[PDB]
Amino acid sequence: ISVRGLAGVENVTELKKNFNRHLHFTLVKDRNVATPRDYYFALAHTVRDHLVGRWIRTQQHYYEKDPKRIYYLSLEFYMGRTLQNTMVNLALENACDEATYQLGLDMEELEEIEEDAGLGNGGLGRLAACFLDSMATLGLAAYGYGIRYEFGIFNQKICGGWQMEEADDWLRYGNPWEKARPEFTLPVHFYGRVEHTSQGAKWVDTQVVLAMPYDTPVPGYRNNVVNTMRLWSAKAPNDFNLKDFNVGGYIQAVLDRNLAENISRVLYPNDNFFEGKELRLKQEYFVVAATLQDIIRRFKSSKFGCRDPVRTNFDAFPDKVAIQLNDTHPSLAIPELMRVLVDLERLDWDKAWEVTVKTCAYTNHTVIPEALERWPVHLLETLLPRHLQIIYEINQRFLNRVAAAFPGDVDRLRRMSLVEEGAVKRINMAHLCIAGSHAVNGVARIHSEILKKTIFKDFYELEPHKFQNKTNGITPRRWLVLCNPGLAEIIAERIGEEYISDLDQLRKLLSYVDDEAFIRDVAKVKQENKLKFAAYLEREYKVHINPNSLFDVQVKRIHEYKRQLLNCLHVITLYNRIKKEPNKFVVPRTVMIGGKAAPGYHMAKMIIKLITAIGDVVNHDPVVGDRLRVIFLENYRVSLAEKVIPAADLSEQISTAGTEASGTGNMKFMLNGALTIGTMDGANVEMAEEAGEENFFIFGMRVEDVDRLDQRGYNAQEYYDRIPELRQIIEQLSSGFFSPKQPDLFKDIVNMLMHHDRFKVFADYEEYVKCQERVSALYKNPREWTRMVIRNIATSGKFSSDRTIAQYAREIWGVEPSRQRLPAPDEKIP
Amino acid sequence: ISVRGLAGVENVTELKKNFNRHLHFTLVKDRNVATPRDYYFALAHTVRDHLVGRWIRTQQHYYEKDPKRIYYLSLEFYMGRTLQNTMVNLALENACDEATYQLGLDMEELEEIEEDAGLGNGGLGRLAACFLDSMATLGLAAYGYGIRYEFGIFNQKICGGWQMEEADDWLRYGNPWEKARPEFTLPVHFYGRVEHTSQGAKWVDTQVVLAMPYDTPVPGYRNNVVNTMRLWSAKAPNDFNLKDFNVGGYIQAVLDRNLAENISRVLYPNDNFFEGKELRLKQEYFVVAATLQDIIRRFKSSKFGCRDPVRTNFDAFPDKVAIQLNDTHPSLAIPELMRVLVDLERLDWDKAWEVTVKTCAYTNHTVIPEALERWPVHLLETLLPRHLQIIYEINQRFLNRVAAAFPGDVDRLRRMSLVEEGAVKRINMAHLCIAGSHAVNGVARIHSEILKKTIFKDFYELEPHKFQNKTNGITPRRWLVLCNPGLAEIIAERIGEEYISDLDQLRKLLSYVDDEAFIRDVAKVKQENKLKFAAYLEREYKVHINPNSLFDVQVKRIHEYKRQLLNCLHVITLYNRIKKEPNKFVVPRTVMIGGKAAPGYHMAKMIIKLITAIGDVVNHDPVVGDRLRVIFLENYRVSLAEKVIPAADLSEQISTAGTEASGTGNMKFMLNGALTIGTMDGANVEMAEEAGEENFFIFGMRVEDVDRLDQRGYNAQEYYDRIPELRQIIEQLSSGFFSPKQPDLFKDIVNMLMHHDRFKVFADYEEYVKCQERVSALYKNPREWTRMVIRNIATSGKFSSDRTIAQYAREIWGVEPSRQRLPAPDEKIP
Ligand SMILES: O=C1NC(=O)[C@@]2(N1)O[C@H](CO)[C@@H](O)[C@H](O)[C@H]2O
Numbered sequence A, B: 001i002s003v004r005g006l007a008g009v010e011n012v013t014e015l016k017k018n019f020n021r022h023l024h025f026t027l028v029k030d031r032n033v034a035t036p037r038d039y040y041f042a043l044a045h046t047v048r049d050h051l052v053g054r055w056i057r058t059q060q061h062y063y064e065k066d067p068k069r070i071y072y073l074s075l076e077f078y079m080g081r082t083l084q085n086t087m088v089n090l091a092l093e094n095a096c097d098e099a100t101y102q103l104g105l106d107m108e109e110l111e112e113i114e115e116d117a118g119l120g121n122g123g124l125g126r127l128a129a130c131f132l133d134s135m136a137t138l139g140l141a142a143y144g145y146g147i148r149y150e151f152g153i154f155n156q157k158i159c160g161g162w163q164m165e166e167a168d169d170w171l172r173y174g175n176p177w178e179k180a181r182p183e184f185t186l187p188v189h190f191y192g193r194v195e196h197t198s199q200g201a202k203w204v205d206t207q208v209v210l211a212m213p214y215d216t217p218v219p220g221y222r223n224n225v226v227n228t229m230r231l232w233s234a235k236a237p238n239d240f241n242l243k244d245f246n247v248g249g250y251i252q253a254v255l256d257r258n259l260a261e262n263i264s265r266v267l268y269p270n271d272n273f274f275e276g277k278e279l280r281l282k283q284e285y286f287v288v289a290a291t292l293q294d295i296i297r298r299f300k301s302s303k304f305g306c307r308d309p310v311r312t313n314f315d316a317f318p319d320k321v322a323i324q325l326n327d328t329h330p331s332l333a334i335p336e337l338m339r340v341l342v343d344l345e346r347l348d349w350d351k352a353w354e355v356t357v358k359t360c361a362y363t364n365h366t367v368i369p370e371a372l373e374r375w376p377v378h379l380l381e382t383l384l385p386r387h388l389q390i391i392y393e394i395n396q397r398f399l400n401r402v403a404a405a406f407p408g409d410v411d412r413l414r415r416m417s418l419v420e421e422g423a424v425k426r427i428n429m430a431h432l433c434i435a436g437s438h439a440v441n442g443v444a445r446i447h448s449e450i451l452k453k454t455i456f457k458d459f460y461e462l463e464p465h466k467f468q469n470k471t472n473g474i475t476p477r478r479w480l481v482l483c484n485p486g487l488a489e490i491i492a493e494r495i496g497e498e499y500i501s502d503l504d505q506l507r508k509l510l511s512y513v514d515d516e517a518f519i520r521d522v523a524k525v526k527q528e529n530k531l532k533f534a535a536y537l538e539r540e541y542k543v544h545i546n547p548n549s550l551f552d553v554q555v556k557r558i559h560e561y562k563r564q565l566l567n568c569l570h571v572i573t574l575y576n577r578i579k580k581e582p583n584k585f586v587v588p589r590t591v592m593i594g595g596k597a598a599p600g601y602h603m604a605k606m607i608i609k610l611i612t613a614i615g616d617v618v619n620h621d622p623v624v625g626d627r628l629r630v631i632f633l634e635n636y637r638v639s640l641a642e643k644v645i646p647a648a649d650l651s652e653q654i655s656t657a658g659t660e661a662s663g664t665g666n667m668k669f670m671l672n673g674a675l676t677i678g679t680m681d682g683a684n685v686e687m688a689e690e691a692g693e694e695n696f697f698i699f700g701m702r703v704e705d706v707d708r709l710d711q712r713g714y715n716a717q718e719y720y721d722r723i724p725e726l727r728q729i730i731e732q733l734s735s736g737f738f739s740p741k742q743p744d745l746f747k748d749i750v751n752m753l754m755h756h757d758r759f760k761v762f763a764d765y766e767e768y769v770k771c772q773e774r775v776s777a778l779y780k781n782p783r784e785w786t787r788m789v790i791r792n793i794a795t796s797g798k799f800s801s802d803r804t805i806a807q808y809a810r811e812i813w814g815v816e817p818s819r820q821r822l823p824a825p826d827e828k829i830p
């Protein structure tokens, strides 16, 4: 059937009876009233059974051996569905396929019923998910820590061409994967004040909110390791949230509990944008406070909570603990770790600081200013008074370090301050992270260089040793074997299965680049993939596309820096050329643009309306026929990504050079047989570098060119004046060609494009359509297109998260990865 | 061990491995980290497994045979713990006891970990629970319908002698008994307006709240019948509760969902008191609207949703459906049933009315005016506009009936109106229920007579056939076999086990009233019970009592009509007499008073403070010694009741004649070997009537005497003037003898007692202490005390809820009870 594992005789039988056990005993249903959803759960519960045994021994293992623990703190974990992924990592896919088949059910149909764990916005969230899978696969004692939002990223609906947001009630029918652990609930404080008494400061008169943990298993790839993702839920105490007496109402008191529990209710839908709302800050301290107590408790036990030197010496803390800050979101971990060590454990400042710096590491994910976290002091002052005091003290000592290093450099002092003066004082969270971490890394080579050269230049001059780079990657399991079994099978037929946990072995595919059978096969799976997606489209969304055309897709969050607008300009150009010479042949294309716009991002939502507007015109022009289709992919999410990417021919990664930190979608397309048209931005550079620029479609300004233009000054009118095709499009938008009933509908876009384009869309227009002509030319030659594809696939190995994690492990965490199978799952009951 | 069933060889082994399966696979724990709470859940899950098989066949059964369905609507279901009860009804108690013993665990210790399902306030709620158990035991196709509050009756805490209320988060660790059924969610409307168009009225522009059902199994006693209790939870739709666009905030929109979900958040803690809050009314319509849709859907299928006459003829609706209104709380079912039939199904008014009256039955539970539901018209007008219109139309037609029957009786017209004019117009829910139900019943013989003679006199004259009586009862299973296995065993040793489902057989115990061994045994279990409670007291609450004293207990909600105050006056009297003649012998007593006061009931909370105040003085007077102890039983609830009642010697049922509708606690004490000192109120009359007044301690005014006094006019000063002992107590309260630091602390009680005593406490004082002297005298003669006890126990059979239900079944529902074992639980998988 494929190498989705063995469909053993004893195990298919075993699976079937356990499916029935759960359908009866767990679901309390009988075959005569069971619906596909019930069947999905019976299976989910059956699959989940297979990894509890391993989950228990893994955790017990780490307790016995006591290795250095890795704590990945992130406010986002974009997990997606987990049934198939679990089958794949446990080698259960074929057995389950067989068993459910024998039970008369279609496994694929049941898999489609599982709701996505949308606890993320995009790249940052998904990176965390891929990292978790890799950390498990590399046998690291790692824990993912975050917030269990009851509402994930909103579900996008397109009404009249506009995006409509609606709550993602992903828990509505329950989550068979999580395990509530009420017994490990912890208290988290807010507000209050600071009392300075005799021997130390005291955080007093605080409001208490409780943190209830929920553990989700994270299985490694076929190694019997099952790590843990712990997600905190907010709960109100039953005392004060009722007991602070003297009139108000008993009923009201109980109803008001949903005020402390609002902390974990919803994920902020912002991607690469900072919103200084109090609720956000609370979510940030909430996950940090709760996680740290869990971390220290585990440390207090270790082998110190037995003997060792005997005296809670936190000197070995860094040797046993490593906490990775996914961006500045969990930044409060630094002043919180200090607070506990100093205020509660009573360590001297300097010893506590040494410990903190040595266990904390920070990862930066963007350089755009509006994405930077700068919290107003008055907010921290009211909500976390002691933390503010600690931050000021950290600042005081840090700046003294700077003054001593750069005597008389008074401007450098204000520039490096964690505290920013002005309208309202703010705290630069990024500066805090750098000062309190022993390592700061970027997510792509150019991004990392930019940090050193620009944004964090002064910090780099101060401590050059802190700055590193760790190019992002993606997990080959979900992003290849799971979403594209067809491609994975033909690759395995030639080079084996060892590449799934060793993606570098894909290079061996280079020697089949002239193999006639392979070229035919690679081309076949892509055709099968395109047909399946073309079908899904009519199935779930309804209104035809042509599977023979080039599948031009751009899927990612909607941003001005991602330049979906530049993609739009090209689409309109193609249209206009066709209307000019109707009877001239052009390579057919289906351009699919999908992504979600943050609710408050007006421009982004305007762009979505533009895309649908172009489709309205283009898709109903008889002269165009089937040569050009414009489709907006609704509710783009992880599960949707697993469907489009394997069916894509052209991947669009056209951000303005220097704005996309790394990107990961680009890698997903490269490993799945799509060719990349993009700019020398983020990881695109390392991808072209790995496959060879000849096998990549690079165009536009480099970072240097962008800066040259800024010195000069960017004037869009110039481009409007010298390019008639560009002029024609802008005047089409301005006159209502794309919005008849509302002719001025797109005035904001035009206005912006001409007067305040921060991402110089016009500047890359000419080189973009010229480059698009080159991909069309190559698509006309199926054999050469497929051969270039094989060059990309065979050369994508570097982009696996196993590589990225192995580097974090060695160069930042100080631990050694291991591909050693944990001693089976085998029963056992001590 | 007792007749808690057989501890079979094959089943104890089977139990043990399933306990281990759940501890591993369900709880995801290993013996080395498992806590008593984990062990409790493993067992709970193991026990729950045994009744799903039966649950499924019972429900399937009713679907095949299609008998008349009984729907018990109540806003309260006081269930208590359900682990032991389930073991008892499935004959699993000994097997589980053995198995857990072999696993090295104490079952009793694990049972104490289960949280109480406190979805009730007291009597009314508990009656519903006992009814459910009886309906299952009598094989009725019955369904309990209510609200799944996430916070039940508050947990009472005594701080400085004052009651402190704190949220009852009973779901904190989960509920292994319920089964969420998201797939059967239903929509419920609120607000909106009424449009009168061409062919009918339309309820329009309504706010939608969703009702998610949760089913809990209700097993019959050893008959393999497992009925269903369906509890609705409120959920916000994800559309409008987000989709009603045009600024407000996306985050805020999601946070505001907890506004529609507040409907099922908390139970109103009022007992025998009406609070016209909007949230209450919403909870009332919510449970009614959701339940009715479920009822009609089931009816639409039946055997009509196949063939029959073919044409949705609701003429057979009454023949297939019966809905019992537990008080006036679910009264809106009447106008709602009309609304659906008329507005949606399009039946003519008269046909719809005939159907409604024929399927609805109402049960009254109190005659005190402040407990009567009278909803302001402006509230119904805004929240349920169409229902108001229907109620007015019902009223219009009903009054026309009256006018025709009593021509010219204009005062009778206004008196009988469902609409009450005055300050603000109100709707008398009780009048609505009578008009729209074919049967109205009281809960005790005298209570029922009072309804006919007083409160509903005019309605009785109009339709005398509607009025009936159904004396309350309690379930012998939980209230005897479960809480008192020792007594149940010795009874079984003599007369067998058939009395558990046939309590009348207890009469056969009369012939052992002179049996020397039996007297010794009955006396022994009561002593063992008293020792166990005396131990629990020091265990969980701490500060000694004497097990040799008479256990004088009064446990029920705190009310002025229950007269805990009268009990207080007696306690103080005993104290004063002892202080007068210290060296005179008196029968030792431990008087225990427990109960909860509604948060807003100032007097009730003042009484609790008085009780603790008396204990402070009395319990620390050296001259008193161990002859008199005053103890306030904290957090009185079902699980606490299962502990005190079996250890009681004297049961206090001293309400003012004519105010306690029936009472059920009184019955619990009678079946458990306690003697009753009480008034000729509620069911006390039928109890004394059954055991013989010689075996009862009756005192005080009868209803007649109370009325005579009211004609005359009640003047408490008179009693104060003629009784020096009474005078002494009042002056002790007035001067601070019981409240040194705050001498005027009890001015409200004294003031009330002397000037506004609605329940004439002083009037029954003399006859009360005189009567108390008689019980002390008899307690001095152990052999005669025990013989009178045997007379009560042997004569309590009439008070089983099986008898009550059998009467409802035959005289109101039109169904025949059956003690036929359902065809085993046996596997089966069609
Ligand atoms: O705030 C961000 N959202 C992202 O997706 C992001 N930063 O992080 C991702 C993971 O490092 C990057 O790939 C992406 O380029 C960057 O925009």
Ligand SMILES: O=C1NC(=O)[C@@]2(N1)O[C@H](CO)[C@@H](O)[C@H](O)[C@H]2O
Residues within 6 Å of the ligand: B122, B123, B124, B125, B127, B271, B272, B273, B365, B366, B371, B443, B472, B660, B661, B662, B663, B664, B682
């Ligand atoms: O509102 C009420 N609360 C009660 O306990 C009550 N009415 O109903 C119970 C069950 O019918 C009665 O036993 C009780 O006497 C009555 O007060």
Ligand SMILES: *Cc1c(COP(=O)(O)O)cnc(C)c1O
Residues within 6 Å of the ligand: A121, A122, A123, A126, A555, A556, A557, A636, A637, A638, A641, A662, A663, A664, A665, A666, A668
């Ligand atoms: C991989 C992924 C992303 C990141 O895409 P980029 O192109 O790096 O912005 C965003 N959303 C989803 C659903 C993803 O799978």
Ligand SMILES: *Cc1c(COP(=O)(O)O)cnc(C)c1O
Residues within 6 Å of the ligand: B121, B122, B123, B126, B555, B556, B557, B636, B637, B638, B641, B662, B663, B664, B665, B666, B668
């Ligand atoms: C039986 C019961 C009641 C009713 O007691 P009465 O004496 O009828 O008021 C109230 N509370 C609990 C916990 C009960 O078990």
